[PDB]
Design a binder for this molecule. Sequence first.
Ligand code: X2N
Ligand code: HEM
Length: 528
Amino acid sequence: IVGEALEYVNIGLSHFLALPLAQRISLIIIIPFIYNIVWQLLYSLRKDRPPLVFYWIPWVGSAVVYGMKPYEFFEECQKKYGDIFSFVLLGRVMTVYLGPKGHEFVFNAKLADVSAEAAYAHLTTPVFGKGVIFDCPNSRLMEQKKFVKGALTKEAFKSYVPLIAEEVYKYFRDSKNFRLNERTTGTIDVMVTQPEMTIFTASRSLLGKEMRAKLDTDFAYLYSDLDKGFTPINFVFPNLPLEHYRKRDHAQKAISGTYMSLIKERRKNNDIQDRDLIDSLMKNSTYKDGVKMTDQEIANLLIGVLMGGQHTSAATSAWILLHLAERPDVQQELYEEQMRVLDGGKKELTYDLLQEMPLLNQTIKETLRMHHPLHSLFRKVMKDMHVPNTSYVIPAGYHVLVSPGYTHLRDEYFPNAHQFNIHRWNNDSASSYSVGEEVDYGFGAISKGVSSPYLPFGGGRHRCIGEHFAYCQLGVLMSIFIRTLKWHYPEGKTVPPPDFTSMVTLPTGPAKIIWEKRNPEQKIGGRH
Ligand SMILES: CC[C@@H]([C@H](C)O)n1ncn(-c2ccc(N3CCN(c4ccc(OC[C@@H]5CO[C@@](Cn6cncn6)(c6ccc(F)cc6F)C5)cc4)CC3)cc2)c1=O
Ligand code: HEM
């Protein structure tokens, strides 16, 4: 008889429940630890699954090392399993596909196969507000990107360039970090100066003079509040009853409220021109089904667009300054270009003249290669995906992770990849371009192929639409920096390592540089 054993299960269950609440808790710990380790070992037997990176702590997965040095993580994984592999991240299984084929597999994936908004909505909806970007169907996103692109035209850029220049000179004149009319040399932290320069120039151009004027008041503090709410933690803890989160939410309401105030006032004046992104969205934000964006959605879309461009651009100009700080040879070469194109500084900078500064654009290009702001782009897998030329199947509920920034740093695709060399882009200074066929997902014709090893602006339906705005802003900014100042490192200092745990791969601060005026007696005019 074995029925005596079935009794003994029951008995065992009872004897278990009467263990001391000390031993019983550790069992509550030690059991999932063992099952996890067992499940992985069984998972490796499955060959329609990409290799899974081993980990001890359940749920947490490889979060720590991935968070701290994702490119070094990816390299070790790549050496062991090749380009396709999975790892556990805070409850989620990420399947990484490295290299150009990975770009193709994720960026060009079927709309039915993956979802970005499913990956990203928690990160962004709390910050931007409802109804826009990733809080709406992909088809709504496609048209929003079309609306915003409508204020990012060549003629807009011609009008923005002098507005941006004015803000940069204003910042050199009035900021305590510079004060060039009073000081001929000084030390700055680029992680302090660049976010300020960035929001000032982006506000003035995209949002207009009134909105820029508000950053000169206490209202600036709300931007700082909202800004602090744009962080990776939102991936895990989007909302939780703390101080941090209420300021953020308050800020969102307060800032969207201000844009709406301006919007409603411009319409109640028939004062709707072609100045800024606000005018533009007012005139052009009706979807194809005839539904119009609400004033709230318009305001929210403004916040999203300003916030995203804030962090990518601010990090990029910081890195540019940092790399040039140890390359007086490159500052020198850039200065010669400025003198040539602007006739010794006589000519006023314009959008057309910016396009005749290939070395400057190449410098932005090379900084975006060495410092892709977003080291990992995500999609949630919605339908089972088979990985071509493999037996691999990525089951729904997984996430795919693509990382062009990792490929940016591979010697195979960029010789001496960890060397800053703007001349690798000689006669190839364009922000990006297509090597063949194009396609349109609803916001303009863009490259069909996404196989370039250089993809700072992504590709496919979720491709950036800010690239030309960013080059315009970075271009004006760096053209004025170069013409006005030389700079270098404090003794024994050099380019800092990136902080891969922040929203963007900004430098680990404080990252200080020492500036000095090229023309000590040059004064910046205007009232203050
Ligand atoms: C827990 C213990 C801790 C210890 C120390 O290990 N740890 N362990 C692990 N980690 C860890 C691990 C990983 C990370 N992150 C990985 C994910 N990252 C990330 C960032 C942004 C992303 O943005 C998605 C969209 C794309 O478009 C944007 C952006 N944009 C594009 N153009 C302009 N803006 C956009 C678009 C349109 C708009 F209109 C606006 C927008 F914004 C938003 C996607 C991914 C951040 C870093 C951080 C920390 C830890 O910290
Ligand atoms: C150096 C500057 C920038 C870089 C490197 C950059 C990079 C990117 C990348 C990689 C994506 C695709 C994300 C994904 O596929 O998951 C993206 C998307 C996007 N970016 Fe940018 N970006 C920059 C600046 C800007 C600016 C200045 C704006 C607005 C003025 C902007 C607005 C957008 C928008 C609207 C999307 C679409 C997101 C989607 O369709 O899912 N970006 N950007």
